[PDB]
């Protein structure tokens, strides 16, 4: 294809994308296909001659869309939001056009320089401690990572390298592997699976800190674990504290665990992948208090700040531990896209106030769902509602709640996922779509309430 | 922004992208900016009120473009090609629209199922051994990785887990760390830096195998290293054999090293990030002979098969070592985009024959540059020209060749990068742009020849 044909087909794709978004409420949010549906519908080999664009777009509607889970339908209330905004789509078109691979500054200066400035923009929007910002010859700085999972791995590997070098300086009689079998990392029992995967990749032990009644990491539980593991010969070196847990959107107490990690020389990484976007709002900034004690901080613009995946924002206090010219030792890959264009377009076309209004609308809708649940004494709220997540369940057995979830997700009118809080099976209601409104939340609750009546009926009859 | 405004701005962006591509030969390929140019030109904080799309696109032209290295200019002859095709751009627009995060099959079935079929399409285009393909209940299969660097790390981690489990089964008295200090991985002395980074992340030793006069790994050098390291107590467990080295596009001898790795129970990973795309052409498929001995194989569609970054294709013979429903234990992150749409659009809109013509044109242009160099006895060809890379230098000192490279890259009419072959400073000429023609290569050589006269003059005067 040459540029003249792209002028035609590109504008046709723009109209197709806009049509899909405008009619997305007519789509069944979760598909009815079963695993392996697609292979019989597609030829077994690539075509030798080109297919037409009309043939391909027809296939998108006829065989791809039936197997799509529509994350951006207003009736998608599963996991956490993923970002979809037209400013980011426009920047992504330019990103593929410039098409640079910014593994070095010389590979494309603007790709690296815009990223450094955008991470300062975002750090200032979150009122991060100045030690995390790159402006004005600070030793800290920020980088875009592909994902919060990758950011947690990068922080673990940096912590691993630092503790090995420290221990080998103290006792030069020590091999790297001899230190390896002693290292232990920590996280909450509510931590995302990315922490376990990072520990497995890094080759170190990982232990969960028991959370309190609010499912938060506290100083008392951390001190109890440290007392045990240090007496056993383990060397704590890395901690993932979570702000906005994937299970119930709980918050580890950084004001308590931060000072302890500093005193113990434990690298403190803060995982705020979802909740971090809300900290641009002054009424939620208190949830980030204690980040001044952290060695690294991370959240995902590509969940809930409208910067299409991939875009994970990671700050560190000392870049040496990982002017910014190179981004090589900051990430796991060497190559990277011009992803800072997406942040630049989104921040500029929405403004800080536009992003704040987006966050506040979602949190308002979350409290609207909470209000409806709190009006039905057959249900209970399991964790305090703070952001765009509500954890709820039918009072009674785990089975009756499992039955409710299966009934909901099988109806495929809305989509939810559950979690386990201790031994308790719990349903999650997450505000996700950019275009969700009060009417959608009210309809979803009516659906949930009707299926609960069926399921409660079936447990006595 | 709502969809109606995206209908306008999206088509405006289509025209901007098409205008940039059509006039790209009027751009200076490498920028004149210096590190840190951008911060003074951009405000220090994000705007509170939205900026206009007109203001942003004006800034793209005025402050972003001056700091862009134009990888898709026909005069970009540096590193290796990176992919830019309009079919991939169209699919990427749809990918951001569907906006699924396919960490599981249920997260969006089509995102996982199309990927499995496209990796079979591509595996069949390369005439890969059937053990690598997923179709027909085979134990092997393919996955898209973010980069060849990530693919090499994934293979190393899989090899690490397998050898630990094997050694602990043989001697249950062994800790993981006790095995760690003995493990050693191997690669050519021409290997990409991704191998060293993978060994550092994985916590294992890495040793380079000396290459022969053609800069290829051979059985004799590998057997000599194994004899030494096994006697020293090291346990070989992982090997990266390279087809199309980053330095000089040389090829490790898989027919020799493959059987050795199998006999030694060394996981054989084949890194063919650049050269792999040419193996869809029957006249180059012989360069892949011996891949039947490999445990994993990887190449980048996002270098030289027109699938815009990111798209790295990795096959394994046993998926257990990492029907396909989940792609979690295949990669380093958990989340992923609908990147298989790009392969589907490119393969269908070009056809196998269109992609073959693309490869063959680039290789023809490479031989055209080689022909010009071979007509000037002041120069020498350092390595056999096989694909889209030519390694050449002025006969004489390393200094005179360093001076030639500085003179070229400072003129900023074309862009080249060098390499070191043993103690020899060598210039690289890589065919990169989708739209490069014979006239561009002929102009570049005339430029190189003129600057060589200046530099040779300056070494005697």
Residue numbers in the entry:
A (entry chain A), B (entry chain A): 1 to 322, 342 to 480
Kindly provide excerpts from the paper associated with this entry:
Aromatic amino acid decarboxylase (AADC) deficiency is a severe inherited recessive neurotransmitter disorder caused by an impairment in dopamine synthesis due to the lack/modification of AADC, the enzyme converting l‐dopa to dopamine. Patients exhibit severe movement disorders and neurodevelopmental delay, with a high risk of premature mortality.
We then transfected the DDC‐KO cells with two AADC catalytic variants, R347Q and L353P, which resulted in loss‐of‐function and an altered profile of dopamine metabolites. By combining several structural approaches (X‐ray crystallography, molecular dynamics, small angle X‐ray scattering, dynamic light scattering, and spectroscopy), we determined that both variants alter the flexibility of the structural element to which they belong, whose integrity is essential for catalysis. This change causes a mispositioning of essential residues at the active site, leading, in turn, to an unproductive external aldimine, identifying the molecular basis for the loss‐of‐function.
